Subunit: 616 residues, 3 copies
Amino acid sequence: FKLIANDGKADRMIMANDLLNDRIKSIMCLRAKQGFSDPTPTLVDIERTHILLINSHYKPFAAMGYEYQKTRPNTGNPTYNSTIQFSIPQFGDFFSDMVVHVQLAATSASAGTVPALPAFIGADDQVLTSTSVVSATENTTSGVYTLYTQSYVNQQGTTQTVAAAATNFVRYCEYPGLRLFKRVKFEVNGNPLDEYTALAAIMYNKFHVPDFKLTGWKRLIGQEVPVEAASNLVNIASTTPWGSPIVALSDVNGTAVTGSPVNAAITARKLTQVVFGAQTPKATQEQLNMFVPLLFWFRDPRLAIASVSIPYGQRFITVDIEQQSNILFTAPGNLFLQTTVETLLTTGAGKGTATGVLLTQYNRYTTYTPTLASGSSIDGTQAVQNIELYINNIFVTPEIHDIYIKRIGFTLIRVYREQVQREVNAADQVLQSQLKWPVEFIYLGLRPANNIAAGNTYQWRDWHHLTSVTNEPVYDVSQSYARVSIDDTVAPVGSTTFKQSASQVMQNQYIVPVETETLDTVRVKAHGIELYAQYRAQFYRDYIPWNYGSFNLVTPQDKGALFLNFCLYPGTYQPSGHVNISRAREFYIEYTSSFCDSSNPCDLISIAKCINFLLI
Amino acid sequence: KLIANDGKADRMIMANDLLNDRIKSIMCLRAKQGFSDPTPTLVDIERTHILLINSHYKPFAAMGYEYQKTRPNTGNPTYNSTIQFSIPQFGDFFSDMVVHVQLAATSASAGTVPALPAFIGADDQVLTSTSVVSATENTTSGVYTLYTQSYVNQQGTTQTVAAAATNFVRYCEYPGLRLFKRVKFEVNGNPLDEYTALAAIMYNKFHVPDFKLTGWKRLIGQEVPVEAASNLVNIASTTPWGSPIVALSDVNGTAVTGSPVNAAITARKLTQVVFGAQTPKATQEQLNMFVPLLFWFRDPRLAIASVSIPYGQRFITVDIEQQSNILFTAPGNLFLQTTVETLLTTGAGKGTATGVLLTQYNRYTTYTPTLASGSSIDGTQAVQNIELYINNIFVTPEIHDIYIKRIGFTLIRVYREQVQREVNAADQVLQSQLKWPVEFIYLGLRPANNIAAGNTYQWRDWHHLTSVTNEPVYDVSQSYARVSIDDTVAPVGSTTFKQSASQVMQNQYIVPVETETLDTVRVKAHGIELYAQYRAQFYRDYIPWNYGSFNLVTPQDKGALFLNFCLYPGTYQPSGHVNISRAREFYIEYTSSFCDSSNPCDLISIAKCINFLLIS
Amino acid sequence: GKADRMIMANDLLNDRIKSIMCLRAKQGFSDPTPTLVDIERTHILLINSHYKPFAAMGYEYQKTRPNTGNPTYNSTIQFSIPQFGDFFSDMVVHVQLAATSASAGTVPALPAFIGADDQVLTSTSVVSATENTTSGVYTLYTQSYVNQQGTTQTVAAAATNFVRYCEYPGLRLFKRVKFEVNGNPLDEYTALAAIMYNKFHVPDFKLTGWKRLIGQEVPVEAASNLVNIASTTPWGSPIVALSDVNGTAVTGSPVNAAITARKLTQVVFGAQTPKATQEQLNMFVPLLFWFRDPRLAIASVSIPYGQRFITVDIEQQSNILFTAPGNLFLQTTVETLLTTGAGKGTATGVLLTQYNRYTTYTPTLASGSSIDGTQAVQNIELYINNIFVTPEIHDIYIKRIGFTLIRVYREQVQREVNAADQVLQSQLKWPVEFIYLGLRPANNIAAGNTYQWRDWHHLTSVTNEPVYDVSQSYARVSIDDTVAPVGSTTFKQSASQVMQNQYIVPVETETLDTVRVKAHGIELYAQYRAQFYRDYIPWNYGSFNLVTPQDKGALFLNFCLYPGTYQPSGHVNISRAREFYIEYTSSFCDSSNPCDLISIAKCINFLLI
């Protein structure tokens, strides 16, 4: 390998090595001519035209150091559903990133009871005890007698008695640290300098937490992380779990049989994910510790705020705490409704009834439904045991401090501007009344009001979703077949003395959350001129987040998270585009919906990140 | 305390004594020169030191951007045709481009239940419209083996041979990437840059990091996994097992191996489901894709001046793939049930249909999803809409005339593709497509069977760069039954104590096992070894791991290889290349343990080259 | 206006243009049009295809064998760094371990009896029973060995274990990795450093390559058959879409599926999965030195050939390769027989009404079947990126750069038995950017830990929680065609519970509750919960250079603003680092659970040319 540095027009345009050699020849000639001791050029001489890919240079930084400080609230002992205020203490010359430690006590539901059994299903042979409800359907035409049985059991199968003791489990809503803070306000002189709601926090959750930060984020805000679990070998090369009668069969013409398993060719095991954190129902949710970070522009160290610039007299962080009934929820515990259907096929007298004779075919179907206990609810006395605000304080030399205060003048900042418009219309043009500055981009969703309804038993999960979520069962079913001869003098093949039994039992059940999009098209108009034409929803949810922002902008998992973009580099401090303030006044977001109507009201959530300034 | 000066280390890193000397100096000068405020500027400070707190930014020359969509000039779009778009006149510059493709809802044509398979056993053969039955006697063992096959639906209902049955339909695994057979950007009828689907899958493997992946999938029609939670599988302090087996101890008090104990955590299982375009469905709903055009000017810095490429002769030209390479037939609600029953009788005629005293009965059952006969894709499926979206950029008239006058030229990156079919285990392949400096090359050896119509897995293998075989993974439901048929005989030890067992296929998984087609790669140019003969994993794993930062993904595909010649692949600033001279006589040598005459493979080679584009 | 004036300052720009064109016209330039550099003195151009030419440079990799002869486990291997390029940069080690199997062994002896009655011992099964004449339940215990197909294995017959590699074997094989210069370690690190990198510095756009480089298996996505088919159901008709006598849908009666869906599962079949034969393992273990950065490649003339070496100490095979249960399983069967007539609850009781079977399978080691100690290190080679520059620039660079800033590892591991302690960091004597911290239980690396192959790199106490997939089964059969079955004891009951699969959940118990950091009478970090160092700090700092770790015990004590960048951005001063205390709280570590406090610091040093 030799390094060729001048090979035609392409190398002269990319490396320009002959101009570089002419610069070096010429620069050594002048250094010598002028009386310099060392004629060889300086590294910045070369870097006037060329870039050095091998370069160890760095700049010394003006001396600095930082330290975190904890602070308790001014507002007494913390509770749910209250406003908590923090003073920004006088410590560092600057303060930067902030995070709040939240501690919620271990908690359990109150003792309740087993509820009443369901109603009868069949019209005949109805018996209701304290442990089961039995009914039947007769069918004297076919000879099939169908017997329904429902009962309450625990996980081990032991039947529970109606009105006996039973306790529900408890669980947290998904991303509890994000729902806990209804509003977060940075306060100076009584006036909000910036504030955001849980709506802005979940938008951050959907758009700005890439994978290399995701496990820490979920742990910071109390969301359970899946744990990987490995099975036994399911495949062992050169063998099979199947009984040999069905293994490696060939038909009478020598063709390998379709549906006949053959030995495995690899040795493998299965991976499955389990969760057992705050969102998983438990008899006792243990103490929940969260570190909810505050999503203000000055998290950036370059944008730390001068302590002398904001009077200690009234600089506050203020956090409105959510109600407990929106954070902690009941859910079925160790109690399951067992539904059982049995079919009896008789041929003799009384066939199709409880008195039929000669039973040829028995079938059984059994599902299990996790059931809530009655009178068992969340402990309304659950203590908020601790809440403390952490502030990164930054310190600089007195010389640099003086120069810095006297010379920057102003700093560019980003603020949140929210608006929530209730909608029953399949199409509307909503004036964006709350927008008043240059807007870089707008988070946009159309969240169905039902996602936050107390009557929605999936509110713990649906609350941060921006679509309509329907719940889709996927059943794991175990299938049995059993055959038995009851006459030891008669060949069973072809005989009714060769009985038949089969059963289908629910092994498990998953719930698939199917998202239904609420937005079809979105149009952005200002003074009657289109900022965005009427484009399909997937353009703002998939394309714009894919194309712009690099590792600062995440293509969101939520099918309802839309990104109205107006700059070229949405993540970066350096400005790169916005919508002017005269247009920011008369600003319309027009949507079309296949979902929203009077029967399904929705909230059009628009959250804008706007450019503002701070003088010192 | 901020320390700022601990000996050698702190001067080299922070140089604070120097900084304070500079401050004293500047303050004395500005006073002596007659400045009223002698405090240094922030600019003075930064000539030697970096300020870790600095809100400085630069104002940007005013610019905005807005998208505009246009319809093709070539009439109504269809499969297997050429679509051409004009790049309309609108902005001073045009940049990122995406194309909305809208394929209609579709479903397969009505077919019939196929014929039953051939007999398996030689004895007792009976063929009926609903089942095929054959047997194998064994009068030595007493085991009578009965084979029965039939067609059923998901509910298990028998289906008559030649009865109506309809296949499901699915899209291939990245329909947006396969659909655009070729994508050209023509100026004056000549291709300035063009790429094929092979370039798109290379982008899919190397340049879609996970924080862009979900959106990327939704843009090009790849279904996205949905997380699904199950009921509780572990409840702390209890167990699903029956109590006779729980927490056993042997005669010596030691806990029994294989005896379950109560759980110690409360947990549920997470599982992923898909139900999008690649899942077989009765109806595949309307497919709306937004396929990004992977040209260099997608970078906003590198937008194309509209004055430089005149309207009326600039075009985006897309060649559309055939429908049969995009939309596919799959089994629907029809399954081959393959049942094997073994009857162990011990009385007279044992091992025969006339055996008397049945002791043990075993049943084994698999289900195989089966295609219906004469049920294929709807060839009339319409391309309902295709539209090119171009981001237009507007700048001030003042900067526009300045920029076009002074910028001179712009760097561009072009695709240079060569495909060579091979039947050799080893070979030297001249790269006749390389005319310009080469930055890096995407390399794969894709078996021809991956894109062949006879491969029933083409819908999935088409983008893979290895040989892919299908290993089954079975979930089996094992049952046992035991029944005494005589109430006067003690069951234990009595042939009246029957035995019955069944093995039922609960589900089946297909594991795609990758067999690598490349063993080593050597790169040789003008008689110079650029890369010595190295194992493939050096190019697939180490080079993508070490280079490119978040611009280079370590590919999942075991056959995706990255030949690198620059230090920062993905950046605009050039960082190394292969000169034109060596690019003009460039050989890729490979060795392969797979490619022979029975397994032809395509040595796909796609280079990214540096070229230049002049103004105006 | 007002807001745009400060962001774009277009009025000032238009005047600078108008101003510049006037001056150039006065001074007699042919072209009054301003330069782009003129514009960039005040404004930034968002559309700009400018670039600088780079001083010519190419690179090539070179491959070298050791100086120490043929490689073996548990030895020291040294590579020279040959004279080739003007600079050398990133380094990677190709390791090739031969295909291997366990030795032939035997089916172990069967378990002891369980019940006190009716004990029977053959070479294929153990049987024992527990009577109950009060209830009439006769319980029958059966244990035996089978293979995966269920064929009964005979005691003392042949059986071979399987072989598996420990997790991340490329990170454990390199016990010590070392860049020696003029006889002295310039930088060195152990496997503890490498696993910290595994936890903090491998983002997921690099993760599949990283795992393939160091011998960690990659999960493979696998799709199933349709489990939901819209407008139909797997359930048989009698239980679908039921309504009660009031017209209300029955709770627990399945309905037709609304979507068509299929499952995705993940499987592994790489070096961590037990196999009859592990095929030859090929790893490319990257060497994690500071000079992997091309900007910081070491100049050849400054550290010439002959006084520069890479020295690697190889782990013992016993901590890399492990035996595992192969195709051998302990089947544990319990059968209950409820009889009501004479002799009820014993083996002679008549009138059997209810049968139940419960069956689990436990993978079982074979006796006398161990790993192959002859297993060869078949090849080991060091790859070095060499960089070439023109003679003119190289002469200038070697005369002008002066020095380069470097980063080096400083490790201390102190065994602890205290629930709380304040531990002096004796290994820090240079500025400190950040420290990786963990309290690893000593049993995670213990040979007596069957799960050592998995726990060795974990920084918490890992416990194993089983998760079972149980197949439930029911059977009824009428044994008298002249008696109506409903309500009759001639209508028999039968049920079985068979283990379909078992998963093992690694539950991590944290060993660190709080961490406080002191240095020379200064609190650098007040006593905070571990989750502040594990979760908040890696989340807020480092951008794509700092991954929030999955290991619940990995902590990041940060002392800089931009960890992972070359430009310095904060450090613990030399005076404080020289008297440095890390105080911890533990709810796990005590006399019975020894733990190792692992502190690995990244320190700043400098290198002269």
